[PDB]
Design a protein around this ligand. Structure first.
Ligand SMILES: CN1CCN(c2nc3c(F)cccc3c(=O)n2-c2ccc(Oc3ccc(F)cc3)cc2)CC1
Ligand SMILES: CN1CCN(c2nc3c(F)cccc3c(=O)n2-c2ccc(Oc3ccc(F)cc3)cc2)CC1
Lengths: 589, 205, 50
C-alpha cells in the first residue's frame, strides 16, 4: 500500500490476502484512505469505483474488505462521497457506479453501511446527448436506478432500513425521476414498456407515501412538467400512456386521467381528464406546444393521441365554424371595399379632404371603415403568417397617415398594401375544404427559384453586355456606352416573349448564351414544378390537420377564451372540479 | 507474426478492399465488425469494445485501413468515388463509415466547405463586375491609369490569382469542368497581356 | 435526396480532404498504445437497453 497503481492492480485481480499485511500497517500509521495521495490524481477517484468496475461477474468479494477498511479509518462521508474532480465527470460516487453496473448484491450492503443517496451528478458526461453529453439521467442516484431499468434498486432504496431516497427531490434542471424518465424514453416498444410501467410505479409510490400532491405536478426550471416535456421532445411512447393513465387503486385512483363514467352496453363514454391540455390561455397548454411548435419531431401521430384529436373537433363545432366564417367574410369584404375605394380613390388631386359630395361621401365612408378594420385587426395582431398581416397593417396605417396631410403621390404603398392584403387572403383562408396544397406550394416555391433566376439573369446580361463593350460600346442600342438595365428589359421582352432586335444580323457569343439561358430556364422550371408538386406534396391529411388545428387554436387565442365558450366541466369532489372532455367510443365486447 | 488479411493481391487491394470494390456487402458487413474474442488471437480484431456506462456502449471500431490519410489506397475513396460499385446504397451504411463521414463533416467539413463556396461565389461576382467594367474605349493591354481603372485592375488580378491557384489545386489532384474553366481563363489573361483586340472573347465564356 | 445526397456530401467531404494536406493536425482519432493493439480508431457511441 504505497501508491494507487498497486492498489488498482490488487483490486482488479480480486486478491485480498496480499493486502491485509499492509492495510493494517497503514491504519497503524494514522493514515486515511481518503487522502488525495490514496486517490487517482487525474480525477480523484478512490479505489472503490475501480474495484466496482472490476466486478468478477458481479461477484467482487473484495469490496466488503474495502468497507471494513473504511469503517476502521473512521471516515465514511469523504470516502463514500468521493466525487470526480475532472470536468468530464461530476459526483459519480459509489452509489452511481454500483447502480450503473446493475449490481444489487452490493449497493444494498454499502447503503446499509451508510452512504449518501442524494449525490448530485451534474456532470458533462451526465447531460443530454443533443446538448453535448453522452447519457442523461436526471443527476440523481435513484433517478439513475429508475432510468437504467432497475425496479429492485428503486424499491430497496425507497424502502431500505437506513436513509431512503425521496422521489420528489429534483436536480439542476429541476427534473426529478419523472422528468428524467420522460427524457430517456423513446417511441420504441422495448424502451416504452419498462419506462411506462416503472414510471407509473414511481408516481403511484409517491402517491402512497404522500397523497398531498401527485409527483407529476413538479415542474422543471423550464416550467414544463413531465407530460409537457414528453409532448415537446416528441415522446409519443410515453405521451400515449400519460394521458390514458387510470390507475385502478381507489386509495390512489384520484391521480387518474382516463376517468371512466358510463356506458350503455355497446357504447363507452370515457371522461378523459384534460386538466392540462388547455389552460384557457392562462398558462402553457399542451395543445399549443404540440401544434404551434415546429421543432416537434413527430406530430403526425401525437395529434392522434385521442383526447386531443377530439378536442380539436369539439372546438371546431362549438366556436370554430362560426368565428372562422365571420372572420373570412369580414376580411374578404374589407379587401373588396378596399379595392372599390382604390378604383374610386380621390381623383383630380385633392388628397387631404376630397369628401364634398354624396359619392365622395360614400368613398370616405368606405375608406374610414377600411382604416378602422385595419387598425382593429392590427390591435388583435399586437395583443397576441402573423408577420404578413403585421406588415400589411403597418403599411395601411402609414398610408392613411400620409393621406391625412394630403401629400401628393404619397398614397403609393397604399395600393401595395392592397395587393398584400389580397395575397394574404389567398394565404390564410386555407380551411375551405382541401384543394391540393396551395399555400404549402407557395412556401415551397414562394421566392426560392425566383432569386436564382434573377441572379443568373443578371450575370448573363452583364456578361454579354461586356462582350458588346469590348466589341463596340465605347451595337443594336446605339452603342454609346449606354445603360445596361435596358438590356435586361429587352431580354425580358423578346427572348422571353418576342420581337428581338436581332442585335447581330457578336454571334458566336450570343447564340451560345441564349441557348444556354433557355436551357437553364427550362430545367429550372420543369425540375422545380415536377419535383415539388409530385413527390413532396403529402397533400391533405396531416398537412390539413395541422392547418385547421392552427386555425382553431389561434381563433381561440384571438378573443378571450375564458368567456362562456370553453370546454366541459365534470365531477365535483371526493373523486376528482377537474374539468373533463367526454369521448364516446363504441365496442362490441 | 502477420494476420493473413494483410496479404495483398497483385492489384494491391487486400480482402477487405476487394470485398468493398466488387460490391460484397455480405462479407464487408462482417469484416469490419470482426472482434474474435480469443485473447491469444484477439489482436486481429476490428470492433474493439472499450467501455460503457450501462445504457451506452462506446465501440472503438478499428479503421486501420478505411483511411490512409492520403498515403495509400483508402476504403472510403474506393467506396465513394468508384462508380462501378454494384450496391453502394447499403455499404456506406455499414456503420463506421457512415459515422466517419459525419465526423469529417463536423471537424473539417463545414468550415472548409463554406470558406470554399464563399470564396468561389465572390470570385465569380468580382469576375462579373470586372466584365461590366472590362477595359473600355479600347486600350486592352495597359488601361490601368486611374483610380477606378486601378480598382478594376485589382479585381482582374485577384481573379486571375484565384483562377491559377484553384487550377493548381485541380492539377495537384466535375473536375473537368473547372479544368476547362481555368485553362480558358488563363489563356484569356495571356491574350490580354498583349492587348490583342477582340481576343478577350472566351473570357466571358 | 437520401442516397443521392448521401453520395453528394460524401464526395464533397472526401475531395475536401483530398484538396489540402490531410496529414496535418486535422485527422481522425488515435487509440490504444501497445500490448493490446498505435492502431488509430474511431469511437461510435451506441445506446441499447439490454
Ligand atoms: C394575429 N392573428 C392571430 C390569428 N388571427 C388571424 N390572423 C390572420 C392572419 F395572420 C392573416 C390573415 C388572416 C388572419 C385572420 O383572419 N385571423 C383571425 C381573425 C379573426 C378570428 O376570429 C374572430 C372572428 C371575429 C371576431 F370579432 C374576433 C375574432 C380568428 C383569426 C387573429 C390575429
Ligand atoms: C479538383 N478539385 C477537387 C475538389 N475541389 C473542388 N472542386 C470544384 C470543382 F471541380 C468545381 C467547382 C467547385 C469546386 C470546389 O469548390 N472544390 C473545392 C475547393 C476548396 C475546398 O476546400 C478548401 C477550402 C479552402 C482552402 F484554402 C483549400 C481547400 C474543397 C473543394 C478542389 C479541386
Amino acid at each position: 500500500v504505497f501508491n494507487r497503481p498497486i492498489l488498482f492492480d490488487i483490486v482488479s485481480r480480486g486478491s485480498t490476502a496480499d493486502l491485509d499485511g499492509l492495510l493494517s500497517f497503514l491504519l497503524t500509521h494514522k493514515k486515511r484512505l481518503t487522502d488525495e495521495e490514496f486517490r487517482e490524481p487525474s480525477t480523484g477517484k478512490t479505489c472503490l469505483p475501480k474495484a466496482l468496475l472490476n466486478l468478477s461477474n458481479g461477484r467482487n468479494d473484495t469490496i466488503p474488505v474495502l468497507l471494513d477498511i473504511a469503517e476502521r479509518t473512521g471516515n465514511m462521508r469523504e470516502f463514500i462521497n468521493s466525487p470526480f474532480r475532472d470536468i468530464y465527470y461530476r459526483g459519480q460516487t459509489s452509489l452511481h457506479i454500483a447502480i450503473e453496473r446493475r449490481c444489487k448484491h452490493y449497493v444494498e450492503l454499502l447503503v446499509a453501511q451508510g452512504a449518501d443517496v442524494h449525490a448530485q451528478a451534474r456532470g458533462r458526461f451526465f447531460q443530454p446527448k443533443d446538448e453535448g453529453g453522452y447519457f442523461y439521467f436526471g443527476e440523481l442516484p435513484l433517478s439513475l436506478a429508475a432510468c437504467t431499468n432497475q425496479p429492485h434498486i428503486v424499491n430497496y432504496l425507497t424502502e431500505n432500513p437506513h436513509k431512503k431516497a425521496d422521489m420528489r427531490r429534483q436536480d439542476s434542471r429541476g427534473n426529478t425521476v419523472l422528468h428524467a424518465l420522460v427524457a430517456i424514453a423513446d417511441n420504441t416498444r422495448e424502451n416504452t414498456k419498462f419506462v411506462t410501467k416503472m414510471y407509473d410505479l414511481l408516481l403511484l409510490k409517491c402517491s402512497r407515501l404522500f397523497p398531498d400532491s401527485n409527483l407529476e405536478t413538479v415542474l422543471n426550471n423550464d416550467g414544463l412538467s413531465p407530460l409537457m416535456m414528453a409532448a415537446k421532445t416528441g415522446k409519443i411512447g410515453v405521451f400515449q400512456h400519460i394521458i390514458r393513465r387510470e390507475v385502478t387503486d381507489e386509495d390512489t385512483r384520484h391521480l387518474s386521467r382516463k376517468f371512466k363514467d358510463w356506458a350503455y352496453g355497446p357504447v363507452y363514454s370515457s371522461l378523459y381528464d384534460l386538466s392540462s391540455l388547455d389552460t384557457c390561455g392562462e398558462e402553457v397548454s399542451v395543445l399549443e406546444i404540440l401544434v404551434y411548435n415546429s421543432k416537434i419531431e413527430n406530430r403526425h401521430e401525437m395529434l392522434a393521441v385521442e383526447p386531443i384529436n377530439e378536442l380539436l373537433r369539439d372546438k371546431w363545432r362549438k366556436f370554430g365554424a362560426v368565428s372562422f366564417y365571420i372572420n373570412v367574410v369580414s376580411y374578404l369584404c374589407a379587401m373588396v371595399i378596399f379595392t372599390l375605394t382604390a378604383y374610386y380613390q380621390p381623383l383630380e388631386g385633392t388628397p387631404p379632404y376630397p369628401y364634398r359630395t354624396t359619392v365622395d361621401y360614400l368613398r370616405l365612408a368606405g375608406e374610414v371603415i377600411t382604416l378602422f378594420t385595419g387598425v382593429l385587426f392590427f390591435f388583435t395582431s399586437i395583443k397576441d403568417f402573423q408577420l404578413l398581416y403585421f406588415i400589411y397593417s403597418v403599411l395601411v396605417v402609414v398610408s392613411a397617415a400620409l393621406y391625412l396631410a394630403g401629400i401628393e403621390a404619397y398614397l403609393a404603398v397604399m395600393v401595395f398594401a392592397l395587393v398584400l392584403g389580397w395575397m394574404n387572403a389567398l394565404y390564410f383562408t386555407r380551411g375551405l375544404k382541401l384543394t391540393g396544397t396551395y399555400s404549402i406550394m407557395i412556401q415551397k416555391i414562394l421566392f426560392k427559384d425566383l432569386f436564382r433566376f434573377l441572379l443568373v439573369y443578371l450575370l448573363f446580361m452583364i456578361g454579354y453586355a461586356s462582350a458588346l463593350v469590348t466589341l463596340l460600346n465605347p451595337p443594336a442600342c446605339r452603342d454609346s456606352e449606354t445603360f445596361s438595365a435596358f438590356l435586361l428589359d429587352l431580354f425580358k421582352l423578346t427572348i422571353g416573349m418576342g420581337d428581338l432586335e436581332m442585335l447581330s444580323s457578336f454571334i458566336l457569343l450570343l447564340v451560345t448564351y441564349i441557348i444556354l439561358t433557355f436551357v437553364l430556364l427550362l430545367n429550372m422550371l420543369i425540375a422545380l414544378m415536377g419535383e415539388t408538386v409530385g413527390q413532396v406534396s403529402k397533400e391533405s391529411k396531416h398537412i390539413w390537420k395541422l392547418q385547421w388545428a392552427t386555425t382553431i387554436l389561434d381563433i381561440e387565442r384571438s378573443f378571450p377564451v375564458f368567456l362562456r365558450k370553453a370546454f366541459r366541466s365534470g365531477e365535483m369532489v371526493t373523486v376528482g372540479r377537474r374539468w373533463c372532455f367526454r369521448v364516446d367510443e363504441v365496442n362490441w365486447s
